[model samples]
Target chain A: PTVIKVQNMPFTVSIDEILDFFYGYQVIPGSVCLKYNEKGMPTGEAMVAFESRDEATAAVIDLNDRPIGSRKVKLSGP
Target chain B: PTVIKVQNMPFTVSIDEILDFFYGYQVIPGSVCLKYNEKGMPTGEAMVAFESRDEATAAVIDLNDRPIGSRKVKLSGP
Candidate 1:
């Protein structure tokens, strides 16, 4: 599996929120991890492991420009 | 209105996640803004302006430890 990391978040978002975004998309199950600082705060960074580069890339394109809270999201690849 | 800025996200997350998380929570509408890099990529930073600090604070507390994509989220205030 390949891991893609997302970082620097304003607050702690929920796991369900993330899953909901990928609801219809295919991805490797249980391959998601949230990166945290020493204070146990979300650093806004996340790593998602995918079975293939295509799937990962597809996710990036699909989720781009989408909003979460007051912010529109950006996408990067593995 | 008060603005709470959230930063450093991995990939682009949907705006719905933010709103869904705050579905039951009372907040000012249209107070959300997404920060982007020179490349038009999300720095993962978001500014959400609310009617009061308490509302912003509440959002932070409520959204803390939430998840989006492969990452759990964090919250902060104005």
Candidate 2:
């Protein structure tokens, strides 16, 4: 499965905000992972699954460094 | 492919919060799905995938009704 890493996200950012940041794209259902520290705490990082490698590639280009809730996110993908 | 539904979440909740809320648990690395409306907006709901059916059942019991940020979540199972 193709996945994209959304890093440096704010601890208060909504899941949908992250989802919408790349919303227009195609992602696999039940494949958005919210990462956490060992204690299971928020790390402001999440990985989302994509249906196609092309869309994952498109996603990084289209949404990297985009602002979400006043913070710029780092996206690693494809 | 066991999944748990997390509902009634806050629009500002972080992915990690959900992650940690169930952090110590075993989850599929890219199996967290955040729900959205047709317009691609946050609905404060998400789905998490677990490796086993028993653990999935255990998760809902461990996390349901637990508060995250300012609200409690609804966890659906197995």
Candidate 3:
């Protein structure tokens, strides 16, 4: 239940990029989900899991309205 | 030389939001430029002017990779 939704991401962002974006956090590779459209295009969103609810909450507060590539991202609670 | 380029902004961001993003800084409404495409769509970028070169540089360092809405923003020197 320590999952959060990240929105308004860059369409081309990769898992590695996301990891780098949250560089100081304890994000695991298996916990990252970059959502895509039915047409297989990126939806500019993702679901990220953290080890603790507090971590997730802190990430949401600290990472929200931040940028990746040419786009800014939004993080919200689940 | 007190202007900085803000990238990764939300397409729907307003002058007020840009001003709030740079809250606690010296920003004048006349110095804000939110760029638009020839098609009249937001280009997701803006040119912001501050009162001093140091203020602009400090803003770029402090506000880079910060958020304004659902997206994160990038600030760079002009």
TM-score on alpha carbons, each prediction: 0.44, 0.52, 0.48
Candidate 2: tens digits of C-alpha lDDT, residues A32-68: 6565553546678877779889999998997889988
Model 2: chain A TM-score against the true structure = 0.90
Runs of candidate 2 with Cα error greater than 4 angstroms are B1-78
Candidate 1 displacement at residue B7 in angstroms: 29
lDDT of candidate 1 over B14-59, digit per residue (tens): 5555555567666554444444433434556555556777877887
Listed per candidate, the RMSD to the true structure in angstroms reads 15.7, 6.9, 15.0
Most accurate candidate by TM-score: 2
Task: Report the lDDT tens digits of candidate 1 across residue range A1-38.
Answer: 45454543336665556666666666555445554342
What ranges in model 3 sit over 4 Å off?
A1-78
Candidate 1 TM-score to native: 0.44
Query: Rank by DockQ, descending?
Result: 2, 1, 3
| lDDT digits (tens) for residues B18-51 of candidate 2 | 7767877887655665655545466677767888
Overall lDDT per candidate, in order of appearance: 0.59, 0.75, 0.71
- Segments of candidate 1 deviating more than 4 angstroms: A7-10, B1-78
